[PDB]
Amino acid sequence: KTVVVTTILESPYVMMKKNHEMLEGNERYEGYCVDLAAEIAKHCGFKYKLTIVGDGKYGARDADTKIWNGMVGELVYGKADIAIAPLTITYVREEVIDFSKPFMSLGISIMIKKGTPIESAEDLSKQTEIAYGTLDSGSTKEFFRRSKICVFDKMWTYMRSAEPSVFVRTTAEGVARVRKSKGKYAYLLESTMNEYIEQRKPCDTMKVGGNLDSKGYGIATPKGSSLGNAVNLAVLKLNEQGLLDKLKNKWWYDKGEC
């Protein structure tokens, strides 16, 4: 009766303990989603086993084979019973799996190295000396691409035609690029990550301006799962008890390095 919980290895959501070599099972892991999982399980009344998604991805659908990868794939194909991770609620994903109500809110934000004369998305669109880009894939990119707003359309026009490329392969790459471009590059990513990195050494970056949109992380379960109901109520219950905020503050600031 053990529930197979799939999740991704992303800080501070899911991380490896300092001594994960001497540990075994769920005790190996720690972090926001790891703590959350314990709560969700306690209120829904079930035993769970935490497993890291094989390909270490969230969930996208190939345009050719139409196959789902990442944690979404593990849910649609019967490899996992529930996904507890920072998985953003989207239209296409909602069509194939069931999402609970958001346990965390977020949106596209701007990351820059401290000292950079940038304060908003508008500031970027008006200049070029300070290059800026996003992940070469994901909701963040397609946001600007399918945006009928001139500010984001102009930013998109720039990003689309730039030399060298302002797009990055991974997030860690984008963050590093900001730290290494000596204040000549700005990275557009999820606010949750932006404000987490801002609290990590060497603490040479900061979040600027407000969010460009509004997304949400949700606990996903296979379409039609009987588990979805209880889990959904658990999230709402945890939120109304300020537990989600407590968990946030904990892994973002209490364990912060600034």
Binding-site residues for L-glutamate: 86, 88, 93, 139-140, 190
CB closer to ligand DNQ, 107 vs 209: 107
Query: Between residues 10 and 123, which has the closer beta carbon with respect to ligand DNQ?
Result: 10
Distance of CA 66 to the CA centre of its chain: 23
Site string for ligand DNQ, 152-191 (x = CB under 6 A): -------------------x-----------------xx-
Give the DSSP H or E segment for 141. helix 139-145
- 224 pairs with which residues across the strands? none
Contacts with ligand DNQ, 128-157, as mask; x by CB under 6 A: -------x--x-------------------
CA distance 22 to 221: 31
- Among 195, 205, 198, 203, which Cα is nearest to 115's? 205
How far, in Å, are 33, 58, 117, 213 from residue 120 at the CA level? Answer: 31, 28, 10, 13
Among 233, 250, 252, 256, interactor with a copy of itself by CB under 8 A: 233
Q: How open is the CA angle 4-8-9, to the nearest 5 degrees? A: 125
Q: Is 198 in the site for a copy of itself (CB under 8 A)?
A: no
Nearest Cα to 121, choosing from 196, 187, 180?
Answer: 187
**What are the residues binding ligand DNQ (CB under 6 A)?**
10, 58, 86-88, 135, 138, 171, 189-190, 192-193
Interface contacts to a copy of itself, rule CB under 8 A: 89-91, 94-95, 99, 101-102, 105, 139, 146-149, 213-214, 216, 218, 232-233, 236-237, 239-242, 244-246
